[PDB]
């Protein structure tokens, strides 16, 4: 019927002054753009069809052509930046925002989807969608006593589009827009659909990725315990963005980090630090590295939760990028920890997996490890036990490697090592 029209046939019907021929031609254009087999986005654009599609969005008297244009434009906006720019250049933003109040839920849903694709392109279009006044009608669609009465796919599209209004960093979304959206985000964070939960956490993940004031706007809304609960979720699409958000929050002030510990996050880390998906282990160890960069009482909480053996674990065997975050976790630990805490580090066996990693080519990880070794040695003198550490480092071939690195031609590995030898190995 309307399957596999030529682009020229589609133009001939859209350029007719017959509304029904235009509807059929527009649906044919929609089916063309619905191919996952390289839809002819460009050819549709070069034919000048976007202004006609945008103008059909306002044909309230003929809701089907509103739906087919919304669908067709959605897919054009789903492509490259230039393809998205063409949809915006045709004036689609104010027309799509008008469709948010449509009495047909399937047209409203499509306009939600389309604005999500436009806002998803980047900061500028995201802020343009906001300036056109999209947030109020979007949030109004969620002003219900119970979210579960909304259609499941409708809710998912709304959450996803809201997710994109929080996304991207240069610049971050407007402060007043984030405050406007956050209460609805907080509610969606408590919904039972895992797709809504994942995209809700992704949204929180975006908002917490910035300076501490942005972190505070989220932390002040009380979402931290719920984030820690979603951290132990079964569905990996939920754990990943929940972990990025928790890890983002512990990049802030010690007080903001403490609320994450207070919510019980450290209890889930034995699983996270051994998780099979390599990216979870990297994110979890990076987060641990930023917790060990905190106060001594916070370092002590890492100790109480039995997480130091798990750091010895990731330092001994893991993806290399995970091992480098483990090195950072150790060095931050030894930079702010007490002498008793640094001695406890030795007794779970940090020293040998630390020295085996001096074998890496990565120049920055060598500075981190050498820095940690120095800090441990500094605690060894306050206990008057520097030699027993040297005997330890020599029996695992560490001293064998520490003075071999003096012939490294980055030249702080040059000297930080040579100091290490002529102060503790002479």
């Amino acid at each position: 019927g309307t399957v596999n029209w030529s682009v020229e046939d589609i133009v001939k019907g859209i350029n007719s002054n017959n509304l029904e021929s235009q509807l059929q031609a527009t649906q044919a254009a929609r089916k063309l753009l619905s191919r996952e087999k390289q839809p002819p986005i460009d050819n549709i654009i070069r034919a000048g069809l976007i202004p006609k599609f945008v103008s059909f969005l306002g044909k309230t008297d003929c809701s089907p052509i509103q739906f087919e244009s919304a669908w067709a434009l959605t897919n054009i906006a789903s492509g490259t930046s230039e393809q998205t720019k063409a949809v915006v250049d045709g004036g689609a933003i104010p027309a799509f925002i008008s469709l948010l109040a449509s009495p047909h839920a399937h047209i409203s849903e499509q306009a939600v989807w389309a604005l999500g694709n436009i806002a998803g392109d980047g900061s500028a279009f995201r802020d343009l969608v906001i300036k056109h006044g999209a947030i109020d009608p979007l949030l109004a669609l969620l002003a219900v006593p119970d979210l579960s009465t909304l259609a499941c796919g409708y809710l998912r599209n709304l959450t996803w589009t809201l997710s994109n209004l929080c996304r991207n960093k240069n610049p971050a979304p407007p402060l007043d827009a984030v405050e406007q959206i956050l209460p609805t985000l907080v509610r969606l964070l408590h919904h039972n659909d895992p797709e809504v939960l994942a995209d809700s956490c992704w949204a929180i993940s975006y908002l917490t990725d910035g300076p501490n004031e942005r972190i505070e706007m989220v932390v002040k809304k009380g979402v931290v315990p719920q984030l820690v609960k979603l951290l132990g979720a079964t569905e990996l699409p939920i754990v990943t963005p929940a972990l990025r958000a928790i890890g983002n929050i512990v990049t802030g002030t010690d007080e903001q980090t403490q609320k994450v510990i207070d919510a019980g996050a450290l209890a889930v880390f034995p699983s996270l630090l051994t998780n099979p998906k390599t990216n979870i282990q990297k994110e979890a160890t990076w987060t641990m590295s930023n917790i060990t960069a905190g106060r001594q009482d916070q370092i002590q909480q890492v100790v109480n939760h039995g997480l130091v053996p798990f750091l010895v674990g990731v330092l001994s065997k893991a993806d290399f990028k995970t091992q480098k975050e483990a090195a950072w976790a150790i060095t931050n630990y030894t930079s702010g920890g007490t002498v008793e805490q640094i001695v406890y580090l030795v007794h779970c066996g940090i020293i040998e997996p630390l020295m085996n990693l001096l074998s890496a080519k990565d120049t920055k990880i060598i500075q981190v490890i050498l820095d940690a070794i120095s800090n441990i040695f500094q605690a060894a003198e306050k206990l008057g036990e520097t030699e027993k550490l040297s005997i330890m480092i020599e029996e695992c071939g560490g001293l064998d490697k520490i003075e071999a690195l003096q012939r490294h031609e980055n030249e702080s590995v040059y000297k930080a090592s040579l100091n290490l030898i002529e102060k503790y190995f002479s």
Binding site: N212, T253, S289, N332
Partner: peptide
């Protein structure tokens, strides 16, 4: 503000 914290 803590200087020992790190971003990705």
């Amino acid at each position: 503000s803590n200087p020992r914290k790190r971003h990705r």
